DNA sequence: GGCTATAAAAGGGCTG
DNA sequence: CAGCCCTTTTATAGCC
């Protein structure tokens, strides 16, 4: 691990990265639909071709403006990589693909404290940051001060930390909340 | 928008039998979610419902989301959503909701005696005290406990009868019930009666 | 399976 | 006519 950086001794495993990239070229979704084959375009529900590729297992939403969105990648670089492969596809279809403006927009990651948690004590103690309605969702939606990431503590110890643009914010969240989780460990 | 909103609030209140207290407080909440609003495109009677939800609970007497909805039209979703929005807006929060919170009402609609109520209420607390039902919704636990209690008395009610009033589903009630059944003995009151004894309670 | 919940981008849609 | 919603991903999990 690296107790200097992950004092908890647990390092959140990244689970889904969402990045956007602007191809510049105005796309013909109608066209792109007809030959892509790994795509899926339905003007009906969603106004964007939905193409997917094996390795890295990602999914892209492509709009007739050049703007693409890559989701599913389990890593930035991988999100980036796949985003290139999409452009090269659009490119190999007859379009002026340009990899302008690529950016990481959200890093979803998960974790396991390995001990059950007394959510109510946490929901009660961090009133300002927690929302725990078993009636609406079985998780305690915690909203961290800094960084501005949302965690979703559960009774089992599994954590889910969303909202990060930089994988390190993800780490800064967990280490922040870990000694709160430990305090409310189930007896 | 506001006055006519209160027109409906009262209608809501009445249908589910709410006295002046929460019925007034819900208007006071609603008037504020107009001043200290930020509830923009939200239904005015969604802001209302949620208010007559955050109200019942602040009065120490809450009813399930399903209960408000069944006097509302605005989905459980929206009342769940504007509810969250409203607490944040107004910088306020509530108290959690527990086993012995719906026991009074659930039992009255179920038409059971004080005997059954008390035991269900003691079972549910020990179910939790004994951590027998880890991540179960308190409503579920309660409806479960109410089934153990009642089934061990004369005045019994079925899972479809309990589920129907608790606002849960037999499947779900079965889930918690079966989780607490193995501790049935340690869960009852002690001085509990017993038209049917524990060794006889439905295993489920 | 489905629903509910969290974050995030894209452009059009429906609207209080 | 600012504001949410649709669509796609992912971890997680109780209720239907």
Question: Which residue, A79, A104, A129, sits at the end of a domain?
Answer: A104
Q: Are residues A88 and A38 in the same domain?
A: yes
Residue A3 lies in a domain: no
Q: How far is the CA of B10 from the CAs of A126, B20, B25, B73, B187, in angstroms?
A: 34, 10, 11, 15, 41
Of A83, A104, A125, at which residue does a domain stop? A104
* Cβ count within 10 A of residue A68: 25
How many independent structural domains does chain A possess?
2
**Residue where a domain stops, chosen among B49, B76, B97:** B97
Largest pairwise CA distance in chain A = 63
Which residues 75 to 104 of A reach strand C, CB within 7 A? none
Cβ of A60 < 7 Å from strand C? no
Adjacent-strand bridge partners of A21:
A68
The residue of A129, A132, A135 whose CB has the most chain B CBs within 10 angstroms, and thus the best one to mutate to test that interface, is A135
The rounded distance, in Å, linking the Cα atoms of B181 and B158 is 16
- Contact state of B135 with A136 under an 8 Å Cβ cutoff: no
User: Which residue's alpha carbon is at the shortest distance from the C1' of D13?
Assistant: A138
Q: Does A160 touch chain B (CB under 8 A)?
A: no
Q: What would the two tokens of residue B55 be?
A: 């109200």
Q: In 3-state terms, what secondary structure has residue B18?
A: coil
The CATH number given to whatever domain includes residue A30 is: 3.30.310.10
Query: What DSSP character marks residue A42?
Result: B
- Resolution of the coordinates, Å: 2.7
Domain boundary (B97, B122, B153) is at B97
Strand ranges of the sheet holding A150-153, from the earlier edge strand across to the other edge: A49-53, A58-62, A67-73, A13-22, A100-112, A158-164, A150-153, A140-143, A130-131
Q: What angle, 0 to 180 degrees and rounded to 10, lies between the N-to-C axes of helices B170-180 and B114-129? A: 70
Q: How many residues does chain A have?
A: 187
Look at residues B97, B115, B139 and tell me which one is the last residue of a structural domain: B97
Q: Give the C-alpha distances (Å, rounded to integers) separating B181 from A80, A176, B90, B174.
A: 53, 40, 42, 10
Method: X-ray
Q: Which range marks the domain in which residue A47 is found?
A: 19-104
Give yes or no: residues B3 and B23 share one domain: yes
Say which of A123, A127, A134 has its CB closest to residue B137.
Answer: A134
Residues A113 and A89 in one domain: no
């Amino acid at each position: 691990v690296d107790l200097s950086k992950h004092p908890s001794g647990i390092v959140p495993t990244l689970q889904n990265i969402v990045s956007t990239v602007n191809l510049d070229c105005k796309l013909d979704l109608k066209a792109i639909a007809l030959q892509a084959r790994n795509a899926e375009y339905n003007p009906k529900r969603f106004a964007a071709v939905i193409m997917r590729i094996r390795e890295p297992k990602t999914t892209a939403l492509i709009f007739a403006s050049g703007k693409m969105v890559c989701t599913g990648a389990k890593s930035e670089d991988f999100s980036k990589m796949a985003a290139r492969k999409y452009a090269r596809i659009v490119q190999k279809l007859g379009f002026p693909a340009k990899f302008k403006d690529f950016k990481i927009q959200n890093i979803v990651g998960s974790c396991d404290v390995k001990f059950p948690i007394r959510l109510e004590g946490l929901a009660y103690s961090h009133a300002a940051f927690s929302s725990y309605e078993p009636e609406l969702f079985p998780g305690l939606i915690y909203r961290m001060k800094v960084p501005k990431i949302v965690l979703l503590i559960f009774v089992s110890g599994k954590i889910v930390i969303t909202g990060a643009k930089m994988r390190d914010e993800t780490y800064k969240a967990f280490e922040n909340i870990y000694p709160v989780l430990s305090e409310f460990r189930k007896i | 928008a506001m006055m006519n909103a209160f027109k409906e609030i009262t209608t809501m209140a009445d249908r589910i039998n709410l006295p002046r207290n929460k019925v007034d407080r819900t208007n006071n909440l609603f008037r504020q979610a107009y001043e200290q609003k930020s509830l923009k495109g939200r239904a005015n009677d969604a802001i209302a419902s949620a208010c007559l939800y955050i109200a019942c609970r602040q009065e120490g007497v809450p009813r399930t989301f399903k209960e408000i909805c069944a006097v509302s039209r605005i989905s459980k979703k929206e009342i769940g959503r504007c509810f969250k929005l409203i607490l944040k807006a107004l910088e306020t929060s509530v108290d959690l909701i527990t086993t012995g919170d719906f026991m009074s009402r659930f039992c009255s609609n179920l038409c059971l005696p004080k005997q059954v109520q008390m035991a269900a209420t003691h079972i549910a607390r020990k179910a939790v005290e004994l951590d027998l039902v880890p991540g179960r919704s308190p409503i579920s636990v309660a409806a479960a406990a109410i089934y153990m209690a009642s089934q061990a008395s004369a005045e019994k009610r079925t899972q479809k009868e309990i589920g129907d009033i608790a606002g849960v589903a037999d499947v779900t009630i079965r889930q918690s019930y079966r989780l607490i059944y193995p501790r049935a003995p340690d869960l009852f009151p002690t001085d509990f009666k017993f038209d049917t004894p524990v060794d006889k309670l439905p295993q489920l």
